[PDB]
Amino acid sequence: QVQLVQSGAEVKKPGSSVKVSCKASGYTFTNYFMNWVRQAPGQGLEWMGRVDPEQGRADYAEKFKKRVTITADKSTSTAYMELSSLRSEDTAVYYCARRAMDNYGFAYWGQGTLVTVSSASTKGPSVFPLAPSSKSAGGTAALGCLVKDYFPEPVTVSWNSGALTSGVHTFPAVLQSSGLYSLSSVVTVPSSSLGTQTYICNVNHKPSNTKVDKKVEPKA
Amino acid sequence: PDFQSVTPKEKVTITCSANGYMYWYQQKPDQSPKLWVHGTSNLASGVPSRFSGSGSGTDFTLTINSLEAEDAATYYCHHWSNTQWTFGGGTKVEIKRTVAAPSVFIFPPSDEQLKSGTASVVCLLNNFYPREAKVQWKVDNALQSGNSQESVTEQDSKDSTYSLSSTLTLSKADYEKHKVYACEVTHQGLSSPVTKSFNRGE
């Protein structure tokens, strides 16, 4: 029952600060360092630093000796990490971590806090059909939806309100030069179904309250 | 981040070079790391005994005997040096299977999109293995460079394949200047490249 519970995701503009929290329970808070670890999207783990909650003292890794302030509040069993003067390359998942009882390895991790740093503003997607080819069948056709020009992540895509799951691939979003994301979702279906069966991609972008139901049909 | 393909039931050894005690972690996507090995050779709690840690000199290893599907993950080493912790670069272990060719599809831009001045042309490569594939866009038989972006799925849980999308982005004006749009795909499972094409407006 050692538990480490972090604060929620933050979308930030360059120049801003963010202070991430890590609430500890199930052990004596002052007995252990609280570590912080960074993981940029699709990249490795990096040790940032740590705080001694008994005396308040912090240590910082060489790479994190600027713009990082790590603290602890004994009375609420909460550790914090403040990141100042944020930059797009600060985009990462940040973890708090405590060592094992009987060794110095990091046995206990928080769930992570996603910090996204971008100059982009909230923006809902446009949804366009990837219509099934007229040359289909073989026997299998592909179709899909292009979900273009949104911020921030994520979008959800379902097919036929969740009834169609077989053969669905929803790709990772790509960041465009504009600073907006784009994503494709595709499904393969029987060619024989195309004249009969309705295919709808159900797209939700909660940050902009955008909900789109796009029917995808053979082009005439 | 190194990439290693392993056939189920085969053995892999990951090396981490460094200058006391080495630690190792397993991490899967959208999860926190799990402590895996501590004190160079001691398994962490709940870790299958088919994993083993070792070290000698400056060379530290994590061996997976008789790999199982659930061992597909990224692994990291971790050590104390001087006045800080250092994590090594990850090693991502994937499942090796028989070569499977992609099924290739091309999609023209929608009329809806074109009415606002951009054309996205999409090429889908579906359910292939291994992950390495080459997509070449051609527009009226001129090879394109610098106007496409691609995305790849994680390995499928059932068939251990990948899928890939490539999107070619043109202005409407540029799209309307040309007739033939073609995606040429090369892959180990394709004896010669596969081309899918359409004529604008057909």
């Binding site: 007995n31 252990y32 360092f33 001694d52 008994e54 003292r57 240590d59 060592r99 110095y104 | 104390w80 001087n82 006045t83 912790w85």
Partner: peptide, 9 residues
């Protein structure tokens, strides 16, 4: 502190 664990500081 130049050690890997608080109990050594």
């Amino acid at each position: 502190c130049p050690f890997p664990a608080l109990e050594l500081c």
